[PDB]
Amino acid sequence: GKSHGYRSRTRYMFQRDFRKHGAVHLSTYLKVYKVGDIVDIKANGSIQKGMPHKFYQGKTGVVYNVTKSSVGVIINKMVGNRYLEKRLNLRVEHIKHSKCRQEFLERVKANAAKRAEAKAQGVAVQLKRQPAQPRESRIVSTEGNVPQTLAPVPYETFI
């Protein structure tokens, strides 16, 4: 027949990295998790208790519950034509912090610092980011950089 289990088709997914087997480094257990923090989910093969499902591997979610050694994650799963929230409790081991949120707090702090300093005089704060604008005009000098003529090479039958 057909087989669709809790750990089906995870042979290369729930597997430790090369030369990275054994116990887990004592850094994950020292991370402090609070309600509202955004974290990523990455299953670890050494610990088989509280392991997330295949779908929730690599997903990013907010923390809503704190337990002895576990946190609750809310993940939006697309079923049919709608997104449904899923509150799943996972161990600390199979969860890591997300650096995008930290970059957001850093940008916010710099944003407020610039809003203070620039507005102390009140001129062109320009607190908003901009994309890659087209390059402006430039002048190139051929002092020791004379353009070398290039021609296509003949076809060769090297073996």
Partner: protein, 171 residues
């Protein structure tokens, strides 16, 4: 189209690690500046590790013939991809300008080897200044002294669909 010689000089995007990148210049026969730039980039990303996103063109100009009123003999080395493999050829054309010579060469190759513009690659175009290094008989036959050849069987063009006199092909 009416091919025109465009020389394009380009260079990699400047970086703090390597300021003032080297400039590479290439002459391409193309219909317009867009085609010339596209061919320049395509040829550059075949001999050098560069790309359009990781490079720029600092100059593009059109080369006009210094003496377009003088009949010249041109030797062209080309490399083309056939239906089965890649081959190298050397063809001799007789024309007053490089653009006309390469247009004639393109028509010749597309008609005689079924090679398209995507297949013919211009390796080198040169002018043979001495009429002794030519190795093609179809070009040598037109360099003979006192060249006089008639035009037998002249065909005239009529503006009417009916003619009241039997035409004559004299000349």
């Amino acid at each position: 189209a009416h091919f025109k010689e465009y020389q394009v000089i380009g260079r990699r995007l400047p970086t703090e690690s390597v300021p003032e990148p080297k400039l590479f210049r290439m002459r391409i026969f193309a219909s317009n500046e867009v085609i010339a730039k596209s061919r320049y980039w395509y040829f550059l990303q075949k001999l050098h590790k560069v790309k359009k996103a990781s490079g720029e063109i600092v100059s593009i100009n059109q080369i006009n013939e210094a003496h377009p009123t003088k009949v010249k003999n041109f030797g062209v080395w080309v490399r083309y991809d056939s239906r089965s493999g890649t081959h190298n050829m050397y063809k001799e054309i007789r024309d007053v300008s490089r653009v006309a010579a390469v247009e004639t060469l393109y028509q010749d190759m597309a008609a005689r080897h079924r090679a398209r513009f995507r297949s013919i690659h211009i390796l080198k175009v040169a002018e043979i200044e001495k009429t002794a290094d030519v190795k093609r008989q179809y070009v040598k036959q037109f360099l003979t002294k006192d060249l006089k050849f008639p035009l037998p069987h002249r065909v005239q063009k009529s503006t009417k669909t009916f003619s009241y006199k039997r035409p004559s092909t004299f000349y």
